[PDB]
Design a protein around this nucleic acid. Structure first.
Ligand SMILES: [Zn+2]
Lengths: 50, 174, 282, 125, 91
RNA sequence: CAUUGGUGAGCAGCGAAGGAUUUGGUGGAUUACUAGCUAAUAGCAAUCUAUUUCAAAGAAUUCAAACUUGGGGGAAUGCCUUGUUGAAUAUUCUUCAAGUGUAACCUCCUCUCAAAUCAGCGAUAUCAAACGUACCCCGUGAAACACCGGGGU
RNA sequence: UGACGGAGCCAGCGAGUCUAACCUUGGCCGAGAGGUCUUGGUAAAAACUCCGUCGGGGAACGAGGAAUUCCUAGUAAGCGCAAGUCAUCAGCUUGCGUUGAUUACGUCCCUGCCCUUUGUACACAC
RNA sequence: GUCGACGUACUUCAUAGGAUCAUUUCUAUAGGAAUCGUCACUCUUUGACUCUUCAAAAGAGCCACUGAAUCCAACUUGGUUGAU
């Protein structure tokens, strides 16, 4: 796993570099809720859920 | 607004169905027989029903024994020997210099039972009549057929040697 | 450069691992050449191959220094760097200068607050053959590594009996001319690795009558190196000693540089083994 | 959205991540104003990208800078680097180009270390 | 091997020193069609000049020097993933 | 406390009988403008036909012609090339033979990657629930510092 | 190149169900091994910035003689933190980061070392 | 010092009986089933075509006129005797 650090080739572009983000320390963050649909409730959904 | 990486449309071979070679595109566990013990085969009782090869007839002539009268000497009980329809199709196919065996094969005490096959080859007509029932008692002297039946459990194989016949997998020898 | 220098390592591996699978084909093409030359019988699995039969019609035209040193071997002079561990004692900072004098083409760069990456990586850039780093215990120098730079091997040496040159007398200063060498008692194939990794630290082709000769002697698994001058009298050669006495012992041999620390270990001195004291070059 | 520009600044082992966005004119370092930098003598070493070009050009922008690594001095060389880079990379993006070449010629004549990292890579003799 | 020269010289050997294969070998684009999509749109370059024919043969020596073309929208997105853009480069 | 994240309520401000986003279709450009048609020194353009023909001119390899073929090996039968047998009076036709002759025809190669995905497996982790430990409370019960259930921190 | 006490903020390597002491008085339980509690003794990021306060040695010793060696930029030097990787070191070793200069960078005059003394290589020039 | 001779030790070498497919009829065998000018419906498989998700990237570019859809502002109608 350290051998892959030596050979990162920092021109690599995979198309899932839009859904993933990265913390400012440098290691990535992944959501607790995981799904694409459990992101954050809209105001119309909260107006019903309250 | 035309798309990128366009390429001339051409014939898939690994995927298309119009090609001849690409046109092509419940378990079964047979129960071991309700007769059979571990190897004992507790159902076979006299009289016996014995299948016969071509080879068992040919070495019966060289060793001067009757079929029916000579089998009862080895077997000590009554037996009904019965040549299948595939085996008689071999005995005719052996030809002119085996015709004295073909006379002795058609004897009204030698029974005949038909089969539903597409073939002459009686070496594999015979084992298939044995797995599906396991009441028969094979009389062969083929080397490859003996090995084909000694792996089958509980089927008394019978061969000819020296003077009289010999049996192998009968527990009730005497 | 950094991407180029990495990818030549990757292809050098795949050119090396190809040879191990083609060493078997290297062996069988000896049999075809000899049996064509003298001898009828031909073995079974080499008989049934039609692949290797057609393959031989090209292969009939084919035919030693180490594979890392192979491109440079006699052509280019080495340029080497003797550098010290970290905040050196004033005894060993003298002793790096005797290593700087024992080789030709050797410069001494004092090390402090360099890292081993940016001293390696700022040396492949400037282009040097290899790197000599020393260590010490309380002024007595103990260890020594030579590490060939263009992804070449390294050899961590332990060196026990040292006598620095500055202890003795103000007898003068060394000859500094290209030395002859003396390699004694190297029989093992690992012993030939230590031959070809030490030998290329000297400038190629010494004169037939240069006057200082550097012996590398291997009695009892401790490579013992001394520095000598010689003159030839009317009957015998008479010699005298200048420069350091070493005992020396390699104990691990990586295929990468001394930067790398996870490279493949060609050899490693096993201490803790039931037959450790028995064998030689083990 | 919000117009921003992110530039880096680097001395010995200290980074400096300066987000520059259009705003009101506040300049923060680590969630603290730039008048409270630690070494207190080198505070005018980070007022250089403020005072070289003129303090008017910070009236519409925000300079959020956060630094890690380094020491006391070698962070001050990182915040003066990322404010100069963060100012001169906002005028080529969201303000006028002729502003940028006025700035890049202003920081150059004063001290080129504001823009490009003076990397003191080793030399063997 | 001297008999690679008759046995291993195949078109699929010479057709994988193509540029879009090399951009898939160096893990630049995800797939091999998608690399043709990035060459044709103009995001890749060899040294100074960008390359626009997809079918550019690339020397093993020249295989070092393929990069994304600078200030591109596809070399900008890569640097946002590592949170390491620097718009003084206007990456 | 920070959002350089999403939704959604408001205000300052900008604000001439409204504003913003998105898109279908046609036109004019995208190089430097001398008109359409035909049988074209002229005629048409409502049409060339009951002048549209004759005359003139016009026939080279005495029958040059795949500059075009993925690479090995073959080519029986073909075809080509040369040699020959036989007939009609040098060519035409016919018969047989031979060619490290072959862009017909047989055969092996021209695929199997210093590759990447999807599926299994599954770690550093995460959310919830139950269960465990201690602690007070409530029901059941006549009652047990309850050896009955439950709630809570 | 001070002494003390607060306050201020700055790193980079490092994470194997593995990381760690001795001696003693005394109680209780236990057939014992031992358990448990008790008791005393002995070992074992900094510089930096800011404020407050201050103005001989306990004989060898007040910054180290002649001589002598190393040393050219993130270098000399100052500072602490870390790990202990089959040799080597724990009386220490090797890493890592912080703050970081002066003086050369010329010349063969000296002391050494070395090379050459057919121009051979092909122009022109010497 | 190496290479023979002998002794020892291991490794290796021969398979056979059938059946089917292979020739633009026919693999050699008569012990084998296939010669038809088609009209519907159901079901399944594959391919385009238009949108399109993981998920972007790039626009043969600019103007003019006419047409449409969405979103507020406005107005009208219904709406606490109950709109969503
Ligand atoms: Zn049958």
């Amino acid at each position: 796993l350290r051998e892959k650090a030596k050979e990162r080739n920092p021109d690599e572009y995979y198309h899932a570099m839009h859904s993933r983000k990265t913390d400012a320390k440098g290691l990535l963050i992944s959501s607790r809720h995981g799904d694409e649909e459990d992101e954050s409730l809209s105001m119309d959904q909260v107006k019903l859920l309250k | 607004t035309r798309k990128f990486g366009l390429v001339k449309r051409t014939l898939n071979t690994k995927k298309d169905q119009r090609l001849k070679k690409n046109q092509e595109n419940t378990r079964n566990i047979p129960q071991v027989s309700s007769a059979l013990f571990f190897q004992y085969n507790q159902a076979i009782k006299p009289p016996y029903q014995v299948l016969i090869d071509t080879n068992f007839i040919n070495f019966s002539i060289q060793k001067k024994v009757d079929i029916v009268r000579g089998m009862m000497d080895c077997l000590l009980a009554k037996c009904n020997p019965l040549i299948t329809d595939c085996v008689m199709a071999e005995l005719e196919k052996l030809g002119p210099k085996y015709r004295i065996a073909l006379k002795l094969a058609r004897d009204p005490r030698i029974k005949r039972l038909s089969c539903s096959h597409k073939g002459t080859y009686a070496d594999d007509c015979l084992v298939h009549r044995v797995l599906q029932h396991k009441c028969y008692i094979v009389a062969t002297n083929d080397a490859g057929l003996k090995q084909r039946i000694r792996k089958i459990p509980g089927i008394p194989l019978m061969s000819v040697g020296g003077h009289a016949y010999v049996i192998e997998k009968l527990p009730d020898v005497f | 450069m950094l991407r180029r220098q990495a990818r030549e390592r990757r292809e050098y591996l795949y050119r090396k691992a190809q040879e191990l699978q083609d060493s078997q084909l290297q062996q069988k093409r000896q049999i075809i050449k000899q049996a064509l030359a003298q001898g009828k019988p031909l073995p079974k699995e080499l008989a049934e191959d039609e692949s290797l039969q057609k393959d031989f019609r090209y292969d009939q035209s084919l035919k030693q220094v180490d594979d890392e040193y192979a491109a440079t071997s006699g052509i280019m002079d080495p340029r080497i760097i003797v550098t010290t561990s970290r905040d050196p004692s004033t005894r060993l900072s003298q002793f790096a200068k005797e290593i700087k004098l024992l080789f030709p083409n050797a410069v001494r760069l004092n090390r402090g607050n360099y890292v081993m990456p940016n001293l390696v990586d700022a040396c492949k850039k400037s282009g040097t053959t290899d790197l000599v780093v020393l260590h010490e215990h309380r002024g007595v120098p103990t260890s020594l590594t030579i590490s060939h730079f263009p992804h070449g091997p390294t050899a961590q040496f332990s060196l026990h009996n040292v006598v620095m040159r500055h202890d003795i007398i103000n007898a003068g200063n060394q000859s500094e001319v290209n030395p002859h060498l003396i390699f004694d008692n190297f029989t093992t194939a690992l012993g030939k690795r230590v031959v070809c990794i030490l030998k290329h630290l000297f400038n190629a082709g010494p004169k037939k009558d240069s006057e200082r000769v550097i012996t590398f002697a291997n009695r009892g698994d401790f490579i013992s190196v001394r520095q000598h001058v010689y003159v030839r009298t009317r009957e015998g050669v008479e010699i005298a000693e200048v420069g350091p006495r070493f005992e020396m012992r390699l104990f691990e041999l990586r295929l990468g540089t001394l930067e790398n620390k996870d490279a493949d270990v060609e050899w490693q001195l096993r201490r803790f083994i039931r037959t450790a004291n028995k064998k030689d070059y083990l | 959205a919000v117009p921003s520009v992110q530039t880096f600044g680097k001395k010995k082992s200290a980074t400096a991540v300066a987000h520059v966005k259009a705003g009101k004119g506040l300049i923060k370092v680590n969630g603290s104003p730039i008048t409270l930098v630690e070494p207190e003598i080198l505070r005018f070493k980070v007022y250089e990208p403020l005072l070289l070009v003129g303090l008017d050009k910070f009236s519409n922008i925000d300079i959020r800078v956060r630094v890690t690594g380094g020491g006391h001095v070698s962070q001050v060389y990182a915040i003066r680097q990322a404010i100069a880079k963060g100012l001169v990379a906002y005028h080529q993006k969201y303000v006028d180009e002729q502003s940028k070449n006025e700035l890049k010629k202003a920081f150059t004549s004063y001290d080129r270390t504001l823009l490009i990292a003076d990397s003191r890579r080793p030399e063997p003799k | 091997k001297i008999s690679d020269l008759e046995n291993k010289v195949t078109v699929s050997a010479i057709c994988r020193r193509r540029l879009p294969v090399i951009m898939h070998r160096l893990k630049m684009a995800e797939t091999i069609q998608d690399a043709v999509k990035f060459i044709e749109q103009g995001h890749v370059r060899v040294g100074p000049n960008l390359i626009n024919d997809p079918a550019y043969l690339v020397t093993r020596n020249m295989e070092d020097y393929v990069t994304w073309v600078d200030n591109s929208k596809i070399k900008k997105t890569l640097l946002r993933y590592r949170n390491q853009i620097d718009d003084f480069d206007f990456s």
